[PDB]
Structure 1
């Protein structure tokens, strides 16, 4: 029976274990190095009236009158008498309005104008929070233009985002900022003084930072009775915020859009006459209802439509969008309907590429007229400003886009919208401690957001791709981001702001996270040694929290600063927290992967390719402006991302100087870059940063094609993502890898992986233990990472590791620049000598 399978399994496992035993890297330093280490171990106001006069003088400006001429047409002006008045009376108000009414650029101006005209115009300072950088810039610029002025330069409006700030004047004025700016402001002055009107906008998205800021405002309102907070949701479940804040008054601002008509799947199939080509938990409960009502619904539909439509709708796939239907719908729209610009929404790249190929396959979609512009976050400069250009008559511009286009693209020309009802979400599995990524049906808010892009300047049409039963059973809203994502950086943010009791505060959030996730995050932080035994923010924790990155990246930055390899480590840290400078165009994907491996050279690493690309870009910038563009074109780089990385490096160096680890704000000073030309030291520092993420690789010698299998301690058998450099590699000097991002899309995937030497794991690793498994005095760092070495060397390695740990604790607790020209604590020098030299195991 099943005994033969067990016999096969045992016979294979014995051989596999016997083959893996004789493939462990040997650890041995030298004859003289042992003597040196032994020796070292043995040695161990008129302004108020001025504002009114300026307003009166500007009231006669021709440009100001012209701006008022358009501003009068906005619906929100009709509520100006009310919107201000209640804001004057109540403390917290909720403003709900549909798309079309410019509440963002009107509500703030109403309060400012009322305060200025009333006389007490020097006692207000409105701070409005936006969820996107480009949105904040555009809103601030437009508001500045609306008052016949310019943003910043001491005017009455301005904005502030990361590394870009045009500040307005202190008294009066408006400041548009992202949520992170306010959350960082909360550290200096906890009560947020000198702010008279805090405005939270687009709060219905329910992102991570807005929820925290809203809770802080709610529990801060007790100590600041004179502070006014104004929330702007957008219809639908706008009563939830009012109930949460204590039944505050609400105002419903009417919208204004051109009429649009919605067609569902049955209407589309009936209209275009399309014949098909010949061939958890809660998610279950809804589906059950969709099953129970499935037959009866059809039993009605057969009387409202033809037989063929019912047959096509019944035999319909519910797990993937069919691109043949979209390709036929676009054909029908092109041939019959009038001029416009089709905009189709797709889940991801796998469908965008297929739809583009299907469209370009047909003969008519190849002439001068039709142009197809895919939109994605991994395409060059979102295909430039081609989408924003006005289409000459007789072209029928077609855009195939993921969700990028439903939030901030603003083509402002489309009239036909096609909505394949599928979106991609990134959940987080607490039991398996791995974040997943799946495709789920769009929510009602998502459907409304996609439909609202059609009618803005001209009446249009919206074509949804699901039947009425699925439309009626759609989720009201997407899951709040507070209930997905690890809560690790947030946990340190709670303690650095002294908000409360790390776990007590998280219970006051709207839709509080599950207790298991909080406990897991606290345990992970305790293991990382950032948090004390009783959650007291150990000295490493303060530096980790004050840095604007994840704790793992923060430790890498600190260790790179300690070991005098600041520049490449800072570049890697900057590129590990904000994208990467590589963009893959739609047509050419093999070429990009072939020219990225050339950048990788022979480092057998993924993080080192970013360093090489940045070094090449910096060397090319000095030559000239045209050379920079040529270099970015040849290697498929992005200039904007590289500039942002440069600014982030500057900010990190400034903070490190502020703490005291380094002696200059410049991240390329020659004093703190001694070990900057060695890749081994950089790899050791990276392994010190991202230690717990270590994967073993096994090369199955023979068996037709030589293949490498990657294993992890907990997550079974992972596989290297094809985008990584080491996807096709088969010759590894060391059989160990470290990674940063690991995701479960369909199978567990590592997105960036780099090999590490045994000495990089022995020192910056777990608890070293010495054993004897009938082979030698094998030394293990975590009981599963085993190396071969004699006992006399393993004992020295363990003692040196203990001394290094003590020295690093002392150095991190009290930072110092450290001088390499003296002999006070030379553990670091000996460790650098060991890592730089020796090694070369090639096993």
Structure 2
């Protein structure tokens, strides 16, 4: 019944006609209208997947992919994985009988790498391409090539942003049909300030109080720059609650950001009975995949945080940027789902007249070194031959290529060097971490470097509570403080973790993130298969306590990321950069003479390094001379 209620049912024949008669079809619509879940059902009913054909729909988000796969499997009254399955990076749940397959962009790029023409798929639907992820646009570039070679292969493009004209020009108007779905949205009126504001949060709180005291019931969703303003809004809202009048509803504040634990992200969906009015302090989470109903009034600051990486310095910073016009329209349309709602954007229409329309792609805002590895693995000597939708910065490409050359994956001529280069190209991970894994075979200690890589890729394996249990966490960590840095501390923690029977109560007692450890287990299993693809044994362990040669492999993997202590407390990188150690690392004040890090995150005053591990000078000297 829910299948038939969606607006897309009445376009089924038209969509099918468009899908059949056009090699590439651009579908424009709003999230939750049924494009994600009902297009596979519709074309399976038509018969596109009949006779060994497979319907491969790309979902660039792992959680979204799994949830949509489960929903489609249950809605079709079929056992999970039998007809519809999911395959996210380093996690596969598929079957030979599976017809509707939901796949991540990176795995599909890998399949292109192994299978240039995708003979097992007759149609592939690209969904949630509006976020413009690096993998998504690289996949789009390769997909133009495969449609060029394959006349039978079909493409369905589903996007939540108005980019169809650009895709039409890129794909050729004679082979693409530009269709737009007609949904329904209650008319939302925008309200703008006559004069520019000085303190947008104070304007927002003023409007929030006026909404509470003067408007009918309805949850208020705010849009704020970042997580630093959340607690300030909690405090002001608590003070307003203490001084709240009897004619005003009990206004409950609710944080919503990416750094929260999942239970905190579940606190917003809770139903507050009585005269309780929810206000959701969301940074940017309440833009996609978030469906709190009853949202009526939204006040938008017009500022959002984001990440920009600096190639010249290999750093990354979280900066505030005015939102794009498309983001403002999406924020305005977010309110009004269930009843009529109003938006109050804290600026003037003259300010709206100047922002750039759509946010730039992540292929234009991420590290292209994996992209260059991918293209070089396919066999593209000249990077300019690939059909980029938007030309990437040339200076970034040459920076990445020079980084790859100094890493050894590329020769003087720019071709893959030895089995090393091709084997690095076959690796999902970055070339820096993969170098240690591939060179560990020469030293017979692959196991611990594999564990290190799995921990690094999975993420942070420690959980830090904000309450008094932080001292308890320190005591919980107090058993495993390694003199040689955080990396060997992580190795010891991982060894005793698998040595403690995977006990979840032990993880609670030690405040250890079990999900990250499981993901590291999957990573290490898949990398074991990756090495066995090259017939490399993975039973090699160092029987001696001397971690020195593991450190040689790491220094081979982190050649650029070395630094030595300065008198002022900061560290001098080999490249003459002033960096500061993060407080989280054990070696915060140990004054270690020579240090080696992995990742650099830069703030407005200090450049902070992470994954701190101590080293010795003569290793570096002997490694550099050869």
What TM-score does the superposition give when structure 1 sets the normalisation length?
0.68
Moved more, 87-96 or 545-554: 87-96
Deviation readout 1:690-739 (Å, 9 max, x if unpaired): 111111212x3xxxxxx512112335322223344333x1442xx11111
Choose from 583, 586, 605 the match for 1:725. 586
Q: How many angstroms does 1:396 deviate by?
A: 2.6
Counterpart of 1:124 in structure 2 is 53
Counterpart of 1:291 in structure 2 is none
Counterpart of 1:186 in structure 2 is 112
Change (3 A) 1:693 1:163: closer
Counterpart Cα distance in 1 of 2:475 and 2:32: 46
Q: Is 2:410 the partner of 1:514?
A: no
Counterpart of 2:449 in structure 1 is 569
**Structure 2 gap ranges (5+):** none
1:366-377 to 2 correspondences below 5 Å: 371-377=252-258
Counterpart of 2:533 in structure 1 is 658
- The answer as to whether partners of 1:739 and 1:750 remain within 8 angstroms in 2 is yes
Counterpart Cα distance in 2 of 1:596 and 1:473: 53
Counterpart of 1:688 in structure 2 is 556
Counterpart Cα distance in 1 of 2:283 and 2:476: 25
Deviation readout 1:216-261 (Å, 9 max, x if unpaired): 1111223211111111122423211111100121111112334433
Q: How many angstroms does 1:557 deviate by?
A: 1.8
Counterpart Cα distance in 1 of 2:602 and 2:298: 32
- The answer as to whether partners of 2:448 and 2:541 remain within 8 angstroms in 1 is no
Q: How many angstroms does 1:519 deviate by?
A: 1.8
- The answer as to whether partners of 2:436 and 2:553 remain within 8 angstroms in 1 is yes
Change (3 A) 1:612 1:357: farther
Q: How many angstroms does 1:490 deviate by?
A: 1.2
Counterpart Cα distance in 1 of 2:491 and 2:254: 32
Q: Is 2:376 the partner of 1:492?
A: no
Counterpart Cα distance in 1 of 2:464 and 2:258: 10
Counterpart Cα distance in 1 of 2:202 and 2:292: 25
Change (3 A) 1:639 1:469: farther
Change (3 A) 1:261 1:642: farther
Counterpart of 2:182 in structure 1 is 254
Counterpart Cα distance in 2 of 1:676 and 1:418: 61
Change (3 A) 1:437 1:224: same
> Helix, strand or coil: the match of 2:211?
helix
Counterpart Cα distance in 2 of 1:467 and 1:330: 18
Choose from 237, 240, 254 the match for 1:359. 237
Counterpart Cα distance in 1 of 2:32 and 2:489: 46
Q: Is 2:93 the partner of 1:166?
A: yes
Choose from 393, 413, 417 the match for 2:274. 393
> Helix, strand or coil: the match of 1:215?
helix
Counterpart Cα distance in 2 of 1:437 and 1:476: 21
- The answer as to whether partners of 1:376 and 1:382 remain within 8 angstroms in 2 is no
> Helix, strand or coil: the match of 1:726?
coil
Q: How many angstroms does 1:464 deviate by?
A: 2.3
Change (3 A) 1:447 1:596: farther
- The answer as to whether partners of 1:380 and 1:584 remain within 8 angstroms in 2 is no
Deviation readout 1:793-818 (Å, 9 max, x if unpaired): xxxxxxxxx6xxxxxxxxxxxxxxxx
Choose from 199, 202, 209 the match for 1:331. 209
Deviation readout 1:601-623 (Å, 9 max, x if unpaired): 2425233343344345444455x
Deviation readout 1:245-283 (Å, 9 max, x if unpaired): 00121111112334433333x2xxxxxxxxxxxxxxxxx
- The answer as to whether partners of 1:491 and 1:502 remain within 8 angstroms in 2 is no
Q: How many angstroms does 1:756 deviate by?
A: 0.5
> Helix, strand or coil: the match of 1:348?
coil
Q: How many angstroms does 1:654 deviate by?
A: 2.5
- The answer as to whether partners of 2:256 and 2:265 remain within 8 angstroms in 1 is no
Select the structure that is richer in strand: 2
Choose from 39, 43, 49 the match for 1:107. 39
Q: How many angstroms does 1:590 deviate by?
A: 6.7
Deviation readout 1:58-103 (Å, 9 max, x if unpaired): xxxxxxxxx3xx3222221222221111221121111112345221
- The answer as to whether partners of 1:580 and 1:610 remain within 8 angstroms in 2 is no
Q: Is 2:64 the partner of 1:135?
A: yes
Q: How many angstroms does 1:551 deviate by?
A: 0.5
Counterpart Cα distance in 1 of 2:149 and 2:319: 44
Q: Is 2:600 the partner of 1:742?
A: yes
1:394-543 to 2 correspondences below 5 Å: 394-432=275-313, 434-498=315-379, 500-506=380-386, 508-538=387-417, 539-543=419-423
Counterpart Cα distance in 1 of 2:431 and 2:189: 50
Q: Is 2:78 the partner of 1:149?
A: yes
Q: Is 2:424 the partner of 1:544?
A: yes
Change (3 A) 1:502 1:530: same
Counterpart of 2:103 in structure 1 is 177
Deviation readout 1:402-458 (Å, 9 max, x if unpaired): 223323343345333332211122223455554443211111222233334333334
Deviation readout 1:316-347 (Å, 9 max, x if unpaired): 33xxx643333333333334434333332322
Change (3 A) 1:620 1:459: farther
- The answer as to whether partners of 1:100 and 1:256 remain within 8 angstroms in 2 is no
Change (3 A) 1:478 1:87: same
Counterpart of 2:519 in structure 1 is 644
Counterpart of 1:238 in structure 2 is 164
Change (3 A) 1:410 1:90: same
Q: Is 2:1 the partner of 1:72?
A: no
Counterpart Cα distance in 2 of 1:724 and 1:615: 20
Counterpart Cα distance in 2 of 1:461 and 1:589: 43
Counterpart of 1:223 in structure 2 is 149
- The answer as to whether partners of 1:697 and 1:710 remain within 8 angstroms in 2 is yes
Counterpart Cα distance in 1 of 2:235 and 2:372: 46
- The answer as to whether partners of 1:442 and 1:474 remain within 8 angstroms in 2 is yes
Q: How many angstroms does 1:543 deviate by?
A: 1.6
RMSD over aligned CA atoms reads: 3.0
> Helix, strand or coil: the match of 1:406?
coil
Larger radius of gyration: 1
- The answer as to whether partners of 1:422 and 1:441 remain within 8 angstroms in 2 is yes
Counterpart of 2:227 in structure 1 is 349
**Structure 1 gap ranges (5+):** 1-66, 267-300, 302-312, 664-668, 701-706, 768-801, 803-843
> Helix, strand or coil: the match of 2:451?
helix
- The answer as to whether partners of 2:565 and 2:591 remain within 8 angstroms in 1 is no
> Helix, strand or coil: the match of 1:750?
strand
> Helix, strand or coil: the match of 2:564?
strand
Change (3 A) 1:134 1:493: same
Deviation readout 1:570-613 (Å, 9 max, x if unpaired): 23212323431344456679759956974762425233343344
Counterpart Cα distance in 1 of 2:524 and 2:574: 34
Counterpart Cα distance in 2 of 1:609 and 1:183: 35
Counterpart Cα distance in 2 of 1:571 and 1:344: 42
